[PDB]
Amino acid sequence: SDEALLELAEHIALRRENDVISTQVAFGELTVNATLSGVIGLIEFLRNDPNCRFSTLIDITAVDNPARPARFDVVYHLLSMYQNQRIRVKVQVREDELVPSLIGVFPGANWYEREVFDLFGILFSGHSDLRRILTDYGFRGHPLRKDFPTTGYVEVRWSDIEKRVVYEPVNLVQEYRQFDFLSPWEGAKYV
Amino acid sequence: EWHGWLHHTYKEPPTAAPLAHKPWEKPHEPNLTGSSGAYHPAGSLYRAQPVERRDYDAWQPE
């Protein structure tokens, strides 16, 4: 499957030269780095091409990398039940950059893009129903960004005065403890 | 003494196979939650002498 995945990666790199930035095969998985402007065209090719028939969209997610000029990665996981193979597609996205929506290709991409928008704040263009899907109504912020606190900023309580569940600033009886165990020794890479 | 047998953890009853007890063990108590013997933290307002807490010693004027 390692030779098979390398052969498949050449087929994609050849047929979609301008979409593909590079390919990698690590830990038995093929990853394709693609340009933002060509990701929809490439995923469409992967879905429909005979050699690579990736007709199941497994999921879409994002990864935050604040140290990088384009801080976000958007990652597409696709499965082919007919060819019995998997592929990962990665695109680098800058903050406030728009990502084209995949709902034209996969109707089931709709909720995954809402989740990326909710938890990372990445907007998708061409999305019919783009609204928060997992956080509370009117939530401020995007919790899966590395610079959002784990406990957030606000918490709810039932107020006897307002007879409502209201938000208040977070007050922790015991503050979150973040132990740092990491050793100053990397170890060796023996040949 | 009987909890293990009643919950099928042990095959034999304490009548036939009594449990070994250390001299520092204490007698069993039921759940005391709705009573005055219920456990409460030292700083609880139930205690009526909640333990005062501090982590520095203050200077006292002469």
Binding site: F27, I58, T61, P107, I133, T150 | -
Partner: protein, 410 residues
């Protein structure tokens, strides 16, 4: 694919249908609703009890698991997996262990591999018993859940005897399984397997050929192969339509190659087919459990954890040997480091393909942990699936999709 403006066989157009739809019959179906699993707020637009729009509002059980995982070590994150598809917790633990084992390049012992298959199939029965019999309760059958959940009670006792917890085992570990099974537990699992087909017959006698049951499921929620590919269907959601796809065979993991079992598939892809597929899968899982117990008895005594640099030593060694004490101290505080890389490890979970997308960065904590729940993709299709049906069919459709919101919301 839009039926809000009624279309009649006589071509008539009502005066009111001409006006723009401002005053529609919208109803909150859940969260506090017996068919809504407690945390589903589905907004339904009804027209004479015909479902014209279904708008699932989820996140009522979103707990920020993926954020909480980023500040914990790999071992501290293992119990989070238990609480996603919490009906069958060890099956979800398996994806986390497989991902770590792949990135670290670790080989788990043979006995641990057999135990993982054994308790994964227990989880499949735990899930299918819950799914099938509460699905029956969704179409009004009161009794099936009572019979099924007695058998679940017995399986939860097998959970507790392996790990000390009836539900949230935290039993599968990176490097194998935490503890070995007592010999008398293997005898009891074998004894339970001999009785279980009788309960499956009794449930089949009560339901399968009941005319009411057929009229509540046959030709309801029909899924074609093309629909399956629109919505990321996996598991019984594709097998009910006749696609003999099962990750244990197509992309084998653990030691499933050497077990004998078959893949049930449906021909019509409706709620009735998926019910029959789940009943058949329960029989197949029972057979796997029987083979695994036989293999475990025939195995030579061995360890259940890989030990080495990945798992703590045994307690007796920890209290005697200096190396073991250090490895115990370090692995329970810092934990192993996982080399930089990204993997997606998937299993055939009872509800479909469950996967973990793990981004490691060489430290003792995950950089990113994305959890792929099969129910997230299945629930998203309820609007398409329920359009055109009546309100009474909605609980049956929620049942057939096999939704647990611990994994939908995470």
């Amino acid at each position: 694919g839009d039926i809000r403006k009624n279309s009649y066989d006589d071509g008539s157009m009502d005066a009111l249908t001409g006006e723009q739809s401002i005053r529609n019959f919208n109803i909150n179906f859940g969260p506090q609703h017996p068919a809504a699993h407690g945390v589903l707020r589905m907004v339904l637009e009804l027209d004479g009890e015909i479902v014209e729009r279904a708008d699932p509002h989820i996140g009522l059980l979103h707990r920020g698991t993926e954020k909480l995982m980023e500040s914990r070590t790999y071992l501290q994150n293992l119990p989070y997996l238990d609480r996603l598809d919490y009906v069958a917790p060890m099956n979800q633990e398996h994806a986390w262990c497989l991902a770590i084992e792949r990135l670290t390049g670790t080989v788990i012992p043979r006995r641990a591999s057999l135990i993982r298959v054994l308790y994964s199939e227990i989880g499949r029965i735990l899930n299918h018993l819950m799914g099938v019999t509460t699905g029956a309760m969704d179409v009004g059958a009161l009794t099936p859940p009572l019979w099924g959940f007695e058998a679940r009670e017995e399986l939860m006792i097998f959970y507790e005897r392996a790990c000390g917890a009836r539900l949230h085992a935290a039993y599968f570990r990176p490097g194998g399984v935490h503890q070995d099974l007592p010999p008398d537990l293997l005898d009891d699992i074998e004894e339970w397997c001999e009785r279980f087909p009788k309960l499956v017959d009794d449930l089949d006698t009560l339901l399968t050929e009941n005319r009411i049951f057929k009229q509540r499921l046959v030709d309801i929620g029909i899924v074609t192969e093309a629909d399956a590919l629109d919505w990321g269907y996996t598991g019984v959601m594709v097998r009910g339509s006749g696609l003999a796809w099962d990750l244990r065979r197509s992309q084998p993991y653990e030691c499933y190659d050497e077990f004998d079992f078959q893949i049930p598939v449906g021909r019509n892809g409706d709620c009735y087919d998926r019910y029959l597929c789940r009943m058949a899968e329960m029989r197949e899982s029972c057979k796997i459990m029987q083979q695994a117990v036989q293999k475990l008895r025939a195995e030579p005594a061995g360890d259940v954890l890989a030990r080495g640099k990945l798992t703590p030593p045994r307690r007796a060694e920890m209290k005697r040997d200096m190396e073991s004490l250090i490895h115990h101290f370090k692995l329970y505080t810092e934990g192993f480091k996982v080399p930089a890389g990204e993997v997606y490890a998937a299993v055939e979970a009872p509800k479909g393909e469950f996967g973990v997308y793990l981004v490691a960065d060489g430290t003792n904590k995950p950089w990113r942990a994305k959890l792929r729940a099969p129910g997230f993709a299945h629930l998203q299709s309820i609007d398409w699936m329920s359009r055109g049906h009546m309100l009474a069919d909605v609980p049956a459709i929620i049942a057939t999709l096999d939704i647990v919101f611990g994994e939908v919301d995470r």
